[PDB]
Design a protein around this ligand. Structure first.
Ligand SMILES: *[C@@H]1O[C@H](CO)[C@@H](O[C@@H]2O[C@H](CO)[C@@H](O[C@@H]3O[C@H](CO)[C@@H](O)[C@H](O)[C@@H]3O)[C@H](O)[C@H]2NC(C)=O)[C@H](O)[C@H]1NC(C)=O
Ligand SMILES: *[C@@H]1O[C@H](CO)[C@@H](O[C@@H]2O[C@H](CO)[C@@H](O)[C@H](O)[C@H]2NC(C)=O)[C@H](O)[C@H]1NC(C)=O
Ligand SMILES: *[C@@H]1O[C@H](CO)[C@@H](O[C@@H]2O[C@H](CO)[C@@H](O)[C@H](O)[C@H]2NC(C)=O)[C@H](O)[C@H]1NC(C)=O
Ligand code: NAG
Ligand code: NAG
Ligand code: NAG
Ligand code: NAG
Lengths: 129, 439, 96, 48, 48
């Protein structure tokens, strides 16, 4: 940072939060960022003994390294890191009680993460020409 | 009237014009964590907020109902697009993109799952590229909040304060697949969206229904097709200008972003407390007085949430009204041609088409536009033979070469009077022009 | 509200407390101009609001479409016009 | 005076928020009525 | 009142949105009335 004059040591935003500082001892300059905060989207089925968890917009490496370790299987879906559900987006369902967004559904037999395709075209094998 | 005749301007030439209409059918699914918004990470606040009891449960319950209404609405719109659509399994949009000299290549995406999420058409691609915060735009913005970027996106600050936009239950790529399928359903047999006939014949019969003789239509077929695809190109090019449909689409994103920004700014109001920061209160006062200050902030923030909830319910009522109109236009302008004059856009409406759009549908309405006119003397009826009356169907009687002839009302073309273009009456009315020599 | 009158109109008290009704962007005189134009568009050629035919013929064809033979309509045209303008007078008088 | 005035400010701001929420609700009905009136102009007056 | 910050700004912003919806609606109604209207310049309602 180059903006700190001799009498200045704190960088403020328009709302009066501190967003940076210059250290009085070392003269080193740092930006300050908020620690991550967020919800877990848990999908539950009455016939199940566990939850399928979605950490929206988080990659599984970040969840495991910075939030919490777990024994559950996990994968990086389009929506974020999914725990305790099998990655089956190649499979598709026409009805879904556990709608996650963007055409993704949680289905329960374990949990599966699958695509939601509620409508089809009717197909005929007749010539176009 | 001079004698029995009136002066009328009848068109002598015409073109097809295209008009865009965006209709909003969806909105950003805002979700609030009331506990995280009101109290952040501070245990002394979470304690006091728990003594307010159900207020956060009520806020969450209303927003979950509102978001369920949006999800149900998006399903009903997709069902309306897919209703009755039948396609040939031989259809391949990589080769099959134009028919009868009319070009649909820009309106048709990838068809079938072998191409993946590429089912967005060139027209829809061109429309989505001008709107940053679509569904995929929100998913990418929130994906970047843990990227360590020096850019302080307000969407990240909102999400860390418990204000977040969820994706819709169907992705815009699925809806773009449904609008693609509903479009090609008018192009090729069985023509399930085009009354079971070829698209060019449907256009021709629709123009004829305006009072244009078929004899000009089926000789000008090339000029009609070129007018049609020129109108479509003019609609596409019109998004580069300050377009009113694109302005409406951006206003949906802007009004949402403004409302979320105002809700975030409510965290920085003091509401008559010593500070708007829970960190400052809890580092200045002990529990007996810190409670009195924090309780003012809790009342301020819970009042702001109740105000935002009441505005959100009011807005989603307008989104349901807009979606009901869009389903009615898909049914009565795109899949069929209902006998309602200004419903499917202004003027002499020929036919309509639909494409996906951020938070809605974009309709293209095509209309018969007169280019030049002839002033002519017309009779609204004739009294003929044994005082039998005749009236013209979708047209007028005219003197041509000192002989009575018919012409269509939307295009000047004198043709002989016959039972094909006439309504009979057993008695002619008064002020019908006398013509004993006819028939 | 600044006329100095002894009358204490509630609209003046509301306005002095910051509550005020603004006029619409188009005056009701302009709108009554538009409804006048839309009305005369059925009276005279080109009959742009009356399907491109004289108003009395449009009325006659609309009645015929209900299942009334054309013969009685074009014979009773004076009676139909009198019934029509009597109905219009009945609406105007019915506002009193 | 601050302690009293702050009760009046909360009362009056609460009343404005209630009036605003009513006004939004009413104007939704005005838009619905105007959409119907345009439909009647098109489908009863300008055509049948 | 200034320590309540954005409360009056929110009240003004919602009422300005509401009044803009009314104005846009009145324009759309007038457009619907005038749509397609063609009159003769010879027309004079003092005699016809
Ligand atoms: C009537 O039947 C004929 C024959 O099936 C149809 O003619 C075909 O029409 C397409 C346009 O839709 C022609 O495509 C053109 O090809 C040239 C290159 O050769 C290209 O430069 C143009 O941009 C355009 O894509 C196609 O050549 C033509 N084929 C033949 C054998 O004439 C016709 O469309 C049918 N309908 C009507 C109303 O005539
Ligand atoms: C940190 O920055 C301060 C301010 O520039 C430095 O203090 C000044 O150092 C110069 C050179 O020795 C003196 O002429 C000034 O009188 C000092 N004081 C002030 C208030 O300007 C300080 O030396 C820096 N320290 C480190 C470790 O970088
Ligand atoms: C989740 O499962 C899907 C479906 O099996 C995987 O997507 C396929 O990945 C392979 C390798 O990249 C590609 O060849 C296929 O074309 C992909 N199919 C589709 C439908 O996209 C996906 O990679 C899996 N993801 C994880 C993290 O396990
Ligand atoms: C939709 O099509 C897929 C693939 O053929 C099929 O698995 C599914 O059962 C169909 N669903 C409906 C509702 O037709
Ligand atoms: C179309 O499908 C039916 C039923 O499977 C079959 O009898 C017919 O031979 C098929 N025709 C073609 C061209 O695939
Ligand atoms: C109709 O208008 C177009 C565009 O001005 C012109 O190319 C065409 O020759 C005209 N046709 C007639 C019959 O006037
Ligand atoms: C997200 O971050 C990547 C890497 O910094 C960047 O390429 C991309 O444009 C960003 N997208 C958004 C919406 O911020």
């Amino acid at each position: 940072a180059v903006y700190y004059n001799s009498w200045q040591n704190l960088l403020y935003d328009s709302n009066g939060n501190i967003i940076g500082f210059k250290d009085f001892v070392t003269n080193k300059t740092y930006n300050i960022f908020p620690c991550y905060a967020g919800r877990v989207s848990a999908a539950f089925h009455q016939n199940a003994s566990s939850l399928a968890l979605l950490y929206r917009n988080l990659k599984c490496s970040y969840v495991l390294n910075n939030i919490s370790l777990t024994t559950q299987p996990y994968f990086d879906s389009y929506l974020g890191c999914v725990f305790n559900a099998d990655n089956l987006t190649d499979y598709s369902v026409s009805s879904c009680a556990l709608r996650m967004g963007s055409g993704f559904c949680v289905d329960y037999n374990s949990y599966r993460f699958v695509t939601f395709e509620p409508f089809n075209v009717s197909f005929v094998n007749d010539s176009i020409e | 009237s001079v004698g029995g005749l009136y002066e009328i301007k009848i068109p002598t030439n015409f073109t097809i014009v295209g008009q865009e209409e965006f209709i909003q059918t969806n909105s950003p699914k805002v979700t609030i964590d009331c506990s995280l918004f009101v109290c952040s990470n501070y245990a002394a606040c979470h304690d006091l907020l728990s003594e307010y009891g159900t207020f956060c449960d009520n806020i969450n319950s209303i927003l979950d109902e509102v978001n369920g209404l949006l999800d149900t609405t998006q399903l009903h719109v997709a069902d309306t697009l897919m209703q009755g659509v039948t396609l040939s399994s031989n259809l391949n949009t990589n080769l099959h993109f134009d028919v009868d000299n009319i070009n649909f290549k820009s309106l048709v995406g990838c068809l079938g799952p072998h191409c993946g999420s590429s089912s967005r058409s060139f027209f829809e691609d061109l429309l989505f590229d001008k709107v940053k915060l679509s569904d995929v735009g929100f998913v990418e913005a929130y994906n970047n909040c843990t990227g360590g970027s020096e850019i302080r996106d307000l969407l990240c600050v909102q999400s860390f304060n418990g204000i977040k936009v969820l994706p819709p239950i169907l992705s815009e790529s699925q809806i773009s697949g449904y609008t693609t399928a509903a479009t090609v359903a008018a192009m090729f047999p069985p023509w399930s969206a085009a009354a079971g006939i070829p698209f060019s014949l449907n256009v021709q019969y629709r123009i004829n229904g305006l009072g244009v003789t078929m004899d000009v239509l089926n000789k000008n077929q090339k000029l009609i097709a070129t007018a049609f695809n020129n109108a479509l190109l003019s609609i596409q090019n019109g998004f580069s200008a300050p377009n009113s449909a694109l302005a409406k689409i951006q206003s949906v994103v802007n009004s949402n972003a403004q409302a979320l920004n105002s809700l975030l700014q409510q965290l920085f109001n003091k509401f008559g407390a010593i500070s708007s920061s829970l960190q400052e209160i809890l580092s200045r006062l002990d529990p007996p007085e810190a409670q009195v200050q924090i309780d003012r902030l809790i009342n301020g923030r819970l009042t702001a949430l109740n105000a935002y909830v009441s505005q959100q319910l009011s807005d989603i009522s307008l989104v349901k009204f807009g979606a009901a109109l869009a389903m009615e236009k898909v049914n009565e302008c795109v899949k069929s041609q209902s006998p309602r004059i200004n419903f499917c856009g202004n003027g002499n409406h020929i036919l309509s088409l639909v494409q996906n759009a951020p938070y809605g549908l974009l309709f293209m309405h095509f209309s018969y536009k007169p280019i030049s006119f002839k002033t002519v003397l017309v009779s609204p009826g004739l009294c003929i033979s044994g005082d039998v009356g005749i009236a013209p169907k979708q047209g007028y009687f005219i003197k041509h070469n000192d002989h009575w002839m018919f012409t269509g009302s939307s295009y000047y073309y004198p043709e002989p009077i016959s039972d094909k273009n006439v309504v009979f009456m057993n008695t002619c009315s008064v002020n019908f022009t006398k013509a004993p020599l006819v028939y």
